[PDB]
Amino acid sequence: ADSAVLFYIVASQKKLSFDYTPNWGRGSPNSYIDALTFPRVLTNKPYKYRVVKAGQDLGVRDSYSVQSDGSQKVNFLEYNAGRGIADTQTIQVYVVDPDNGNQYLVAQWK
Amino acid sequence: DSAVLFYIVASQKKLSFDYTPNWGRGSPNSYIDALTFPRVLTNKPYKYRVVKAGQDLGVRDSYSVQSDGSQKVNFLEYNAGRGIADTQTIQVYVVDPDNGNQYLVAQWK
Amino acid sequence: DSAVLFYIVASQKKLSFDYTPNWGRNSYIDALTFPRVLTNKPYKYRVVKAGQDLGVRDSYSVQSDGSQKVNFLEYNAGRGIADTQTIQVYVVDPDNGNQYLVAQWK
Amino acid sequence: DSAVLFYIVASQKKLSFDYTPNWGYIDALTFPRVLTNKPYKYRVVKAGQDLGVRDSYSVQSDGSQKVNFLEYNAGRGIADTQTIQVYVVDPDNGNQYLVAQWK
């Protein structure tokens, strides 16, 4: 039951809109996923992203900048030494809170 | 409160809401007779409880969520057909139909 | 819901509470006691009997052993409530007037 | 934060925990009474450097759990000069929450 939390948020911020519907970008070949873009990301803090590939923590990188349409791109090339991630691997993407370094899963591939 | 927001993101990828209060005024202008929210949450058919100057006016049935996402709370339905004099504090609570929990969403003075 | 739990651990490193409802019965329910209530704010309680809002009353003191008792005689014009009906008990937040369910009978 | 406190009260009506950091050169961190709803792991970060995750020691009968920094720092304690952050790791999603900090 998550109404108590939702309205804890409404209490703090009356007007809020976000969209973390995952857009998985595919390089060449299509087998590989090389990016993830969110249509509308939270902007209260300059969040960072951590990527996990098949159980391997690829660490934290600087975020690409929120674009004027509110979207943000995570470029997996920046985390994976210049290579896409084969789509048979599970990919986890975390937001990292800059204040305490907390990590929250926001996207998962398979 | 980042931990709570992303708890919401975890369960609800895409969410938009707007409870910026639009205080309606009858005639005379001194009286507030309504409150309108531009875009309410719709996951549950919430209702509204109104407290006028510390007096609990109780719960009533919600007006319809309109096609633009808006929802109106008519204080005439809580205050026996009179607006609320703007010198009184007004508290509006959403009521959770599952457990009857109450959460403040708008406050006049 | 682990994010929320550790949000609490974050704000408050050490915490113990116990709201396991001890109902006071022998067919009418005359009271409800909680072994260990939260004490960060002086909470009041609102009681609803079989859907009927009996409203808010002033709280009894938290006892030395951390317990607090809600006496339904103060809410129901001096009368117990028959187990027939569903009793809901809400904590009332004195800051904003919010209320959260914390106990239910049937 | 009362709204969230009582949401926890709602989900579990009886609960006690104690994460007041017992620091023991700092070799280790002990928590008198950890949550046990999941089998949490811990991640350590030293002076900004991610030491990563290690398997957890068993929760003691008195509810306490010990994090041993020798397992995270290649057999060496951490000098109190540096800031140590300690995160619980949620085994379901891999989320991490800060639960202790040294300066």
Numbering used by the authors:
A (entry chain A): 5 to 114
B (entry chain B): 6 to 114
C (entry chain C): 6 to 30, 34 to 114
D (entry chain D): 6 to 29, 36 to 114
Please, what does the article write about this entry?
Taken together, these findings indicate that glycosylation of FIP-nha impacts its thermostability and digestion resistance.
To study the impact of glycosylation on functionality of rFIP-nha, two single mutants (N5A and N39A) and one double mutant (N5+39A) were constructed to remove glycosylation sites. The SDS-PAGE results showed that the purified WT, N5A and N39A were partially glycosylated, while the N5+39A variant was indeed unglycosylated. However, we only managed to obtain crystals and solved the structures of WT, N39A and N5+39A. Unfortunately, none of the structures contained a density indicative of N-glycosylation. SLS and native-PAGE results suggested that rFIP-nha and its variants were all homogeneously tetrameric in the solution. Highly glycosylated forms of rFIP-nha seemed more stable, indicating that N-glycosylation might contribute to thermostability. The stability of rFIP-nha during pepsin digestion was in this order: WT (T1/2 11.6 min) > N39A (T1/2 1.9 min) > N5A (T1/2 1.3 min) > N5+39A (T1/2 0.5 min). Double glycosylation significantly enhanced the pepsin resistance. Resistance to trypsin digestion is shown in Figure 6: N5A (T1/2 longer than 240 min) > WT (T1/2 89.3 min) > N5+39A (T1/2 13.9 min) > N39A (T1/2 8.1 min). However, there were no significant differences in tumor mitochondrial metabolism inhibition among the rFIP-nha variants toward the tested tumor cell lines.
